[PDB]
Amino acid sequence: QANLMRLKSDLFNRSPMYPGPTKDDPLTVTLGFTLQDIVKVDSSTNEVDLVYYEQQRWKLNSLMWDPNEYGNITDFRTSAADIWTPDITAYSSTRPVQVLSPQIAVVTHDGSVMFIPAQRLSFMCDPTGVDSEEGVTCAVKFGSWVYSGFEIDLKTDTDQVDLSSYYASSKYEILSATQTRQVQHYSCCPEPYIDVNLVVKFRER
Amino acid sequence: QANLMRLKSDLFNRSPMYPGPTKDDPLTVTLGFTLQDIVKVDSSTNEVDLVYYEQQRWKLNSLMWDPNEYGNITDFRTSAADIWTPDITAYSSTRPVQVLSPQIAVVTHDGSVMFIPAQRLSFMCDPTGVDSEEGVTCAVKFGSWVYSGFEIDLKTDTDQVDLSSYYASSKYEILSATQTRQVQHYSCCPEPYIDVNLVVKFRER
Amino acid sequence: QANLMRLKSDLFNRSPMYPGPTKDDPLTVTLGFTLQDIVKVDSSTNEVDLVYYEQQRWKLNSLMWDPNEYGNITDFRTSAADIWTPDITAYSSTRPVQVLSPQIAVVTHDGSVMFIPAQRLSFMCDPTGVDSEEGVTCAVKFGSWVYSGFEIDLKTDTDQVDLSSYYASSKYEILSATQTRQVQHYSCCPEPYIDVNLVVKFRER
Amino acid sequence: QANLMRLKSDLFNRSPMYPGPTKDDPLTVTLGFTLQDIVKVDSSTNEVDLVYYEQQRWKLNSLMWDPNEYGNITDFRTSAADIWTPDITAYSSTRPVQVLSPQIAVVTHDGSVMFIPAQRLSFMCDPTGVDSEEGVTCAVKFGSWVYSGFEIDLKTDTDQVDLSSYYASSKYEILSATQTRQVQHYSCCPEPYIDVNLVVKFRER
Amino acid sequence: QANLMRLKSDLFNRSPMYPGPTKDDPLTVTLGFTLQDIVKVDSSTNEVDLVYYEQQRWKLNSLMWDPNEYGNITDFRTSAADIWTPDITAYSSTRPVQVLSPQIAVVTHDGSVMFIPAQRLSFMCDPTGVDSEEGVTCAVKFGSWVYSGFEIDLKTDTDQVDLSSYYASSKYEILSATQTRQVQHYSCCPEPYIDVNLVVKFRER
Numbered sequence A, B, C, D, E: 001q002a003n004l005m006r007l008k009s010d011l012f013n014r015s016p017m018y019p020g021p022t023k024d025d026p027l028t029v030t031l032g033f034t035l036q037d038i039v040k041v042d043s044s045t046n047e048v049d050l051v052y053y054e055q056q057r058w059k060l061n062s063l064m065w066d067p068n069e070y071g072n073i074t075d076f077r078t079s080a081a082d083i084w085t086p087d088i089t090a091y092s093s094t095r096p097v098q099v100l101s102p103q104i105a106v107v108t109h110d111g112s113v114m115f116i117p118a119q120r121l122s123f124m125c126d127p128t129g130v131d132s133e134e135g136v137t138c139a140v141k142f143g144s145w146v147y148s149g150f151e152i153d154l155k156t157d158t159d160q161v162d163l164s165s166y167y168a169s170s171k172y173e174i175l176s177a178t179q180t181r182q183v184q185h186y187s188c189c190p191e192p193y194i195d196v197n198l199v200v201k202f203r204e205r
């Protein structure tokens, strides 16, 4: 602990916080979903509720250190409030997202940060058909709220949503779940926007 | 980031916060709504739930900078807690407004601030009739809570509410949505009050 | 803003906060209600929900200033957390009060403070009869929770609750609404106890 | 206010906070309940909701002063966060306790503290029979969560729960309410444990 | 109190907080559950609510002291915010956990910390069958959210969940309740994660 205390002190107290990316200085955030459960479906409001882990990865120069200088410490855990985090948001939620997990990130010597909040999300989705055999399809985009693709580049490692943790006895079985990077384009504005479209196909039972 | 850190430092640490407008020193706030979804109607309580983005714009001299002096930075993003924000409020909500988006603002070198929170709002509205053609109409005024028109002047760029992001599969289709600036007077009160009246006409299906 | 910043600095940063009234040094708070809507009734728990504005006024010597010394500023707005506020509470609520408005007060050069929070309140009342023509009476008292009438004297400008903003299409029409100052005593104790009794008579439709 | 500011300063800023009682240095806390309302019973979960005021009294040497040295001030009010408070807890709640009143205490020159939070509490309780003639009896203990009877001695002034404020039109009439100090010995532990057992007998109507 | 104040000062003010364990410096946390009540099931959403005490024990060198140097004080109580706590989390909750008890820990001279928060948890569980005699079996996993088994080793004293406080009149009787230590080797990674699998078999009545 002697060493880790010093490391944390050097990174967080001697330095101002990282002010977020700029166009001259962009950042890549890697996003990945582990879909845990579809909890609730509401025919009368068209909200559906998901529980998932949202994996977030990025890398900052200002978070790098030589392990040799800190008793061979390769990585540590720290409160998410101690560091900058990206403003990744569901574009079509209907309630504030509920955080199910401690807000703690893992920081590695190479400057990598990994942050994996578990969340319950209510979002817009017409479940009409979910009792049929062919099921229904819903979609929610995740993106930075205020950063364009010039400042924050979104990325996935795979378009397969991780289903290895899906609640086996959920009221709803998952037929397919994909996470797809998209580049929104508008004649409002001569610059791109990046989101990840979480598309879930599911049915009852 | 070298430059942005210094810029934020110069603006926010060396200076006291902006103390809000005065009558000798008023401020114009521009308001605009992007209506996302009418989520829920409650006929027994006459309450209706909206999800929308509320675009807010204003301009402060104390937030200006010459880009040349900060590595050609034209704008940045910052926590809304870092700056003064107007106290725009729904005049007839029945529950505290739920914030759906990160509280982050965009500040431009000319001193412009842009803040676009996503919100869910329950407000007073008698939905009786919504199951027809011709549908039902509901209104809600948004205004400063404590500043008169002498201190804060409200404005819109257009009386058309932005409907380009309305949930196509909402339980409710929008017939029309306007945002209209009103000045009120009141027997009690020498000074003018300004609001923007959000009027939405909608029906089921 | 040059002057207001100085004024706020002089009042709030050079001075300790006001520590609340004492018996040798009492305070008068003026209370008034603007009743906005009766939202819901629950005949199964006997709770009713009101939305109202609660007008609070009091005056502190420590909040006075000569406008001439601060560029003719007569009054300003500030976060309620910057100043002492009285602990006015509903004596018979069943849920924590929900705050519907920004917590901002108006301070005037004469030492007056005006604070007008919008609130939603669930309180004990038995609505049995509300479907009749002659309606039903509910009452809730509000006073200080911890100050006796030796320290805080409550007062109203009028016993008429302001009904000029009542939701015209509420499920409940208001037959009468009064706000009445009351002094009780307790055996054990010389000190008088003050409250304002909000009595509301209402019926369906 | 001149004197009170100084008194508060002397007690709270020049001194560390009181660290809580020890076995060599125990503390008596006096508890009393004012039962305001039984809001609901839930027969499908065995939860029952109470609204009450829980009077708490204790006495600390470190909170004493000679009134003569502070302009004859006998007592003052202060935020409960300014002082140590005992960790009195319902042993069988099913939801976090909801605070209904400002968190302010009254401190007297003799070192007495009085703290009276109003709360809504959902506890365990099988209401089966509450519609019958004799109705039912639920109980909930209150006691320190982490201090044994060697550190915190609980006490009541009376075993009668104060019913003088019970909502006359509650859905439930109170047949009897007692508060009884229990010295419990657990077979895990050599220390004695105290609690106050709030026993309420009630029925419908 | 003279001595305790000094002890707390020496431990918490002169020293930085404990920065959490590292692989070169791991920590054992001992977990144990006291199951208090199964409160509610929702066969519609497949969620189940438990109330339990979660006993947590660990030991830190930095929390040791010689009782002789502090007036023979063997142990003390302190706010859990004053010390590091492990990030033990339910892996399959569907709502944020509700804390029912004061957040206070007991620290012993040997460096032991004991922390026993009472909680209400809604987690994923298909109750279909609970009305039979055989009953239904449900399972929830608890463990660190961000520390691998290289940093935090979980342990139980017993695989028997403590049932000596179970609500005798709960809607649900407990047929069996076990807490079992597991080693899991999830998706991405070469490093184990440790969990305690809380398995509860129950039925109505």
Ligand SMILES: C[N+]1(C)[C@@H]2CC[C@H]1C[C@H](OC1c3ccccc3CCc3ccccc31)C2
Residues within 6 Å of the ligand: C091, C144, C145, C146, C186, C188, C189, C193, D034, D055, D116, D162
């Ligand atoms: C809101 N209160 C706290 C105000 C008015 C109703 C309720 C109860 C009352 O407090 C009294 C009281 C009177 C004299 C000295 C101390 C106290 C506080 C304890 C207490 C306990 C039971 C009933 C009344 C009071 C004052």
